[PDB]
Symmetry: D5
């Protein structure tokens, strides 16, 4: 909050991009075991996506897509944040979500959009990821 | 304003200690760890999931977990050690029950993921969850 | 900022209405009573007993009471009418049950003091609890 | 947001009622006077002298004053009727004492300026102080 | 702190007016209704459904609804009449499109539940949503 | 809720001048029984004296002094407000308090100073008085 | 906060009076209107347009408008009549100018839309804008 | 910052017990010279007393009593805090303050009560003491 | 936080840099210095004097100072790089002037104490002022 | 608010006394060049005086006077703070300000009154001085 100087402060939390390529579950547990009170980031405001988007475009090593903490654990278009927050904001890319081949149930940030809009993607895909934390 | 090995939550800092201690022996450890600490208190439906998940990830152990709830008068009058109000409950199946009329301290049950509570014999030994102001 | 025939609670204002209406009819009655009204939403363990006592003291009859929770998708996707977050639950025992796949609207149960919820058939004509900004 | 005939104190409204009534009558009178009303609960040192003058000046009559503190278990475990915490005591000398046997309700003592408390017979008729939320 | 025929939201008061007026008339009507009023501005993602449901319930008739957003410079430089920041957008599919370079005022689209926007001829006669400060 | 329109709003309390001439101990009781939560006025900040001064000069109908709620109930220079507020501000006139002839234990605003400065006075003197209320 | 015919702005109420008066008498009228009123003061870059528009809408007839800024020392020390700090300026081009003709009071320039300031003779009858605390 | 680690944070202030035995005036000056903005502690709420009590009982090495920043320098029951705070709260033990033999004008916390209640005491005695600091 | 070598003002931390850079190069420097950094934005009349004194006492050289205001689409539409609104202006005499239609980036004028603004060539190597969020 | 330990926290700012002797001109500049966002101290509340008065008395290594950031630049009783704050508070000493021999235009705190009250004195006089900083 109280954020480290290599983290992005925003609306009470601290956000950071991780360039390692991990599957969605791998990345979630990475954040949670990084420090108490960490998850894959949640978004809740129209004005948070641009600030996140620009931050990734400036500190992202590579071009890998970026996981965030939205999941469809019931495979029925009921999307949930892993920080147990409330799905009160959506920023989907065109024609998404689409459950392509019924393989996609996790959510990434699309590089083509500036990491601004969301896409549902195959869980086991190995991407970069964005942790959020309380400090 | 917590140390980076603690859980921030609603202005206080929480932490799981893996050593085994009796309820009283656990409360005293927290109190003497640093000025202004106690066995943790819970006051919101939302704090119960948050704690359960923190423990399930950082509990370098196996056992159940003490919290600072005690039936002092032994008549279902549950006080917190930190002297805060008892305005929230999260019991397990058919708890509290005073099994053998020797159970008066409260623990977090691992079979529930550490979300529900059970009254247990105070002199038994578990891990515990401290609660500190920093 | 709320009239005296209503209960003030956490910035919003509630009132039990005794005329029986089906779930849909009740929601719309609140909506058109005044701009910014819905069937009530509940978000804290502390809000439940305060609503339960208000109903008991001001409710005429022993009928059940509608609240703004329903499953529009008919698959356990519980959504409040006022679009607030489903961040709290107080289900009765063995609920929700989707009994005979006719129950999709949630009521407060009378013989629990109105602390616990039950999903019920939408056409059932109950009392209802409005929630309004002012 | 208090009306003019009430005392505004710390976010609640307080008013004395001079009609003589037993304790359970006083509590239910407030309850049904308006939604969100009970007998007064006192929580701060600074609140006792403020209620003290208010009653001293607007108590048209001469009686003791019920407040919403009672030993519902009859074993010196006192609870407020608004479900609030018991985080403050302001007893008189030699109180509480369960004198004789049935002194389980709490009254404000006129010989203290209505500042200190005495436990008294449930069924005794007194003036009473409602607190409400407007 | 709103009247009852008005919708309270995030510190301001909103109301739908069903008389059909061109954009500049609708702005001037709000302005003269009471000091400190303008055609509504919208600043949060959650504000849109709130307005969308209000209008649907209270829109006597069937029209598009003016809001206080216009492109005075006729070059995609949209400004709110209340001088607030243009920190939020909620366009309909393909809009804004400056059709035939004659569309510079913003309306709410009934075919989206009044959630999404379209740029429209300013002289078109629409219902309108005033926004006042009390 | 707010103050009534014939009252001065200042820092959460309401103040009104009353031109009736009363003894200090009658002034206090008039205020206390005007409405629950009323006492003779209490002043706590440097900037409060000008606001109270100007207000009186405009809505005062007379040339009398004005009682305020400061009292030496002990008769030994222990000045206390009737509202139980903190004696954390002083604005004494020249050579005050004086305990003139061991009879001056109640405090009045001095019209000769614009009603900005205080004077300890005989309590039985009949002056105007300033109430202070919570609404 | 305010009455329904006043402009609420940043915790105060503003209102224009179309009667013509000399500066001194305008100030006197505001002060004896209601306790806690003066000629208006301006402190933020963003307030001047908010006032400029309010007047342009509710000013009947035409003239210039007084505000509560003057110079009693007769140099260039401008003091508000509400004793607030002179921490914001907004003069018209080449103003102030002491056009030694009794020019020591400030008015709003209709040629700017009532946004920028000008020093003009005190005795000149102009309209005025009061600033009240409700 | 907002309280070191061996200090007790409470209601926006920091507190610490010093077991070095000192006189009441000596203890005051010790605090004031420890850091800018320090005094012998001040108590203001019914709930503050037991939090202090529990803290002292746990962290007080030694057995003596404990000074707090309340004294009667007018020697007439005019009790005032050294930090200029308002005497808006009392917590005396039974039969105190008793000005025993007109020697007692400084205040201490009483062991018999768990350091919860107060006692007026000879200002020259040697007790431990409780500092209070803004950080 | 705000390091002791930065200027605290209204929740953000500002620091002068004396290394001479083109405007884009100055912006990309800030953005890459620390997450949450851009060229400075200014929003209050009172912010301009405080920035001015800071630069006059801490900058080295006599270069004009860049800020993050830019006419990106080159039509007198000035936007901040940190995405805050353009609600404040402090232009210099007869500025902006798009001189020779080659000036689209905004600098501070040393000849005004670094208080007023001027549009300038985008690659004019100047000192710059970063605005960060710690 | 984030004051280091050698500074006085008060009402959101940090203050410190410097015993080095410097003129008013020089003292104001040393503060401003110490850290970004510094000036000679400003005072705005009745209660700020005794809190400053006591801090200086405890930490002043000298017998000298103390500069504050108040001066009459126009030279006509238009007292203006150097931090550009409002002159909303006065604490003038006895028979001050007095422009003694039309030479005194800057303001100091006098040791006579425990550094509580103000005197206008000579700009070029070399006194101790008090800085005020945002941290
Ligand atoms: Ca997809
Ligand atoms: Ca058990
Ligand atoms: Ca059911
Ligand atoms: Ca008794
Ligand atoms: Ca269009
Ligand atoms: Ca006298
Ligand atoms: Ca002129
Ligand atoms: Ca004693
Ligand atoms: Ca230029
Ligand atoms: Ca002098
Ligand atoms: Na988030
Ligand atoms: Na807790
Ligand atoms: Na609700
Ligand atoms: Na209460
Ligand atoms: Na709006
Ligand atoms: Na007061
Ligand atoms: Na103003
Ligand atoms: Na204290
Ligand atoms: Na800024
Ligand atoms: Na200051």
């Amino acid at each position: 909050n109280n954020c480290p100087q290599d983290w992005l402060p925003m609306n009470g939390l601290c956000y950071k991009i991780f360039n390692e390529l991990k599957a969605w579950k791998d990345a979630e547990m990475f954040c949670r075991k990084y420090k108490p009170g960490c998850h894959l980031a949640s978004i809740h405001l129209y004005g948070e996506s641009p600030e996140i988007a620009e931050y990734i475009s400036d500190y992202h090593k590579g071009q890998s897509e970026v996981w965030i903490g939205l999941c469809d654990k019931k495979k029925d278009f009921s999307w949930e944040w892993t920080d147990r927050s409330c799905t009160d904001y959506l920023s989907w890319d065109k024609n998404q979500p689409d459950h392509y081949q019924n393989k996609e149930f996790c959510v990434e940030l699309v590089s083509n959009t500036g990491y601004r809009l969301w896409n549902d993607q195959v869980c086991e895909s190995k991407n970069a990821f964005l942790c959020q934390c309380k400090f």
